Amino acid sequence: HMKPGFLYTIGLSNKGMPGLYRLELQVTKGSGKLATSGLWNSSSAKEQVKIAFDYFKANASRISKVMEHDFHLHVVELQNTGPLSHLALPSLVAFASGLLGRSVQSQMVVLGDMSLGGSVTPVESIAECLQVAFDAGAKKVALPMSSAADIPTIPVELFTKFQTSFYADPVDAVFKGLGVD
């Protein structure tokens, strides 16, 4: 499929516009250092990626040691929408994919986000995000469980275009994005 540590995500930009982004995480031999690029000089994006990396360090046993590798997360803005406001959960998925050397499911977009407390949050404007996902050729989507309540907000022609999986927590999100749960 795709290179491990690479994944597509779709989310509302800082200006409220749905956009498609590609996370490109590189893993090397190191000490556990997180470097970032493409974060638009945004302290908010950096803090989100940091929350993701902290959760990664704290729960990497449930998925191997991050302290023996160095990570560089580049973020590619594919549709000129600005900074992505929902980066924690996609970054966690990209971190775990990079570590385990497992590729994210082919033609899948990961949607949703993660709070500091470690709970997943429903996709913001899921109808618009999935419209972007369909227009971008995505075939599968991984969604937070709560977003099921928003299924009736999505036009049925659009929602039934996807093969959809649901995750209950960040680790479950990792397993759904890699294709093993």
Number of domains in the chain: 1
- Retrieve residue 148's tokens: 């099921």
**Residue 41 resides in a domain:** yes
154 in Cβ contact with 130 (< 8 Å): yes
117 in Cβ contact with 155 (< 8 Å): no
Give the HSE-up count for residue 75: Cα atoms under 13 Å, Cβ half-sphere: 31
* Domain extent for 59: 6-178
**Residues 150, 15: Cα–Cα separation, whole Å:** 22
**Residue 1 resides in a domain:** no
**Residue 122 resides in a domain:** yes
| Full DSSP string of 11-65 | EEBTTS-EEEEEEEEEEEESSS-EEEE--TT-HHHHHHHHHHHHHHHHHGGG---
**Residue 59 resides in a domain:** yes
**Residue 103 resides in a domain:** yes
* Resolution of the experimentally solved model in angstroms: 2.2
DSSP state of 136: T
Method: X-ray
Chain-centre distance of CA 45, in angstroms?
13
* CATH value at residue 101: 3.30.230.10
Q: Which residues pair with 72 in a beta bridge?
A: 26, 35
